[model samples]
Target chain A: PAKLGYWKLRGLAQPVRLFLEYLGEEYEEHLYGRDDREKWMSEKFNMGLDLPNLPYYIDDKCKLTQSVAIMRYIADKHGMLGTTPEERARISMIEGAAMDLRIGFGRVCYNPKFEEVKEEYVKELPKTLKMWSDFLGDRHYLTGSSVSHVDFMLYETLDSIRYLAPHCLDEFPKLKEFKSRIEALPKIKAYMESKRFIKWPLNGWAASFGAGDA
Target chain B: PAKLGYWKLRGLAQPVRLFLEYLGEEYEEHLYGRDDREKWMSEKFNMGLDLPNLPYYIDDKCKLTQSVAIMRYIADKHGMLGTTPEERARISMIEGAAMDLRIGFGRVCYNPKFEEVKEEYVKELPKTLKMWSDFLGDRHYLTGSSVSHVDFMLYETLDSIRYLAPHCLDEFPKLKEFKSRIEALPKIKAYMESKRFIKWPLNGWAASFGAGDA
Candidate 1:
């Protein structure tokens, strides 16, 4: 069986989980804590490898790190990479942009205090959202027709922001609609209700992850 | 002739330019100024498109927006996207991660600073750099072995940073070496010496445009 390791938090692991679930691949999700690091290290050391950081995949033949790499691997295996050359290139561009947005969000909105960076975030928010909204304008997914890995990632990213910053999505109705549409996908909707997935609260700035609050 | 419209900066256009240069393809580079909104709008509008963003391409066939799309298109035509299925997937992953790093740097290091939010930039620099350095490790190139678009991008991105923040690359020797190696590529070096390619202090940001100082 393939073994996946990551923190329960939605940082890098969310996209990996979504990709796996989207593909309906069964795998072991080993949630690790600080105390479990030593045990994990022992196992990895025995295998002649250092214990990898969270969001890693250990299959029968290969051990891979990097969440985006894992996502691409799964997407390629499941035929979600793309059907055409143009579509594949477009998907890569969208995935790159999606990553850009997520990192920007983390720096501007999540990292700064409401009192300090609120004005900048507020000013940039509308423009950024508009860019994405316009990019997604009439398309159901980022690319031509069917759901691609970029779509799953886009949905996961928007959902994370909405979960932590609900009012943030209110400024862009199109994005709000996009989020809802993705959430309503039969596979994703089913996964959301599954017992394996954990749900947490939406609260103060640090509510998402108590430790990583900037 | 293929016409490329991108800011004078080295940020996004670097990869596109590198890919084209690798194939010895000739292109016309149109540099836009901050004050040239009308010219920008007219070009994009005449092309029958909305949102006149930089790093756009107009070839004999079609008008292409998005840096990754343009770069991949050039790569596909030139047979440089990758040699095999696995290589292509690896290229995608490397490009995706490089995009992530650039976005993170933009938010934490490049965005205009406000009085209240000043600390946000300082706080994120080390963490983001550390993440990127670890990602690079001992690899000769980002995707391992041969150079890809990601290598060209890293060179441009780091060069831009050094132009703006001199000590930025000093902290990561591996990154500095990687940047130097890519810059030393014969085609890239020749392109740099060419008058057609604009020099540094790019307008928007260095990661995208190698031209100006931020």
Candidate 2:
């Protein structure tokens, strides 16, 4: 079976996990807890991964790190990258934008002065959400009417943002609909209801926020 | 004909510029200067872009933002993403790693406390370089033996890092060799020698470092 490893949090690995379940692929997950750094450090170099990092994947074909890379690997196997040149370009564009969103939010959550900057983040969020809303206007997903690998990322990023600002999505009807559309996917719905789903502590323990039960 | 727009400096657009030249594609450039913020703001929303940003590209196929998206679109046309699944995954992984390196360095360069934190960045630079060095492992390029889209990013990133710390790559002989290999490419060599190459001022004018002549 394929194997994935990450900290015992939803964080960066959740999108990959959600994709794995959406594809109905059987895989083993190695969840490192708060004190498992030493254990991870012990085996990190031995994993045959080119760049040892959290949220790594090991299958018969390859060992991979970088959440986007793992997502693309699975997406490529399932023919979900995009069906056309335009679709592919849209997917690539949204994927990059979603990553920037995730990283920006991660910086806020991990900052020691999160409280001070969070207000600023919230103030500027509408403009950010507006971009997503405009791009996702009337479409079922970020790429097009069909689900793509980047949808998982966009969903995860919006999920975390909503957690931080519960009413953040209220103003963006399209984004709200998009979130519901992803959540309503049969496989994704089932996965969320399962014991395997990790829906809390959206960041690592070092973060100033989103590091505990939600 | 195609068009690409960005600030006068190299910055994020340099890799895309390098790749386009390497492919020998004829294109026009809309270079915004230090006083061109108003000019960019005027047309930022006018462009038919999903998420409008600098380093935009317009071609017969599509209008694209995000440097990676533009690079990937061009790379896809050239069959440079990868030849196999493993190659694709490797390319994605290296691309993600290179972006992280670039962003981290940008943070340092743009920080108001750049002088205070630069030493810390330099101190930790070796561990980061070592990861790239090991991953490279005498390969001709990042993915394997052939040039991939990610090699452009890696080259630009290493070039900027070298500007910040000239001797950083000295200990990583393989990395130095990789830089030399990329620079020696016939197209890249000619492009650098041409009047169009913007070799200095690696960042925006607002940056504390890399914003002026090297």
- Write candidate 2's Cα lDDT for B100-188 as tens digits: 78887775676677787687777768888888888888778887777777888989888887776878768788898888888999989
**Best candidate (score: DockQ):** 2
- lDDT per residue as tens, model 1, A1-214: 6667765556667767876777788888877654666767565434321213456777675556567776777776676766666655666667666765666555543443533655556576666667677767787767756667777777766776665457777777767787776678787778888987745421123432323423
- lDDT score, candidate 2: 0.83
Question: Highest lDDT, which number?
Answer: 2
Question: What lDDT score goes with residue A6 in model 2?
Answer: 93
Cα lDDT tens digits, model 2, A1-214, are 7888998898889889998988888999989976878878889888888887878999887889988898898888887776566667778888888878877777568768778867777776888888779878887777767777788888988888777676877878888887888889998998889988887788977676888644
Deviating ranges (above 4 Å) for candidate 2: none
lDDT per residue, candidate 1, B93-146, as tens digits?
566556655654544344444323433554654555565666677878776677
Every model's TM-score? 0.77, 0.95
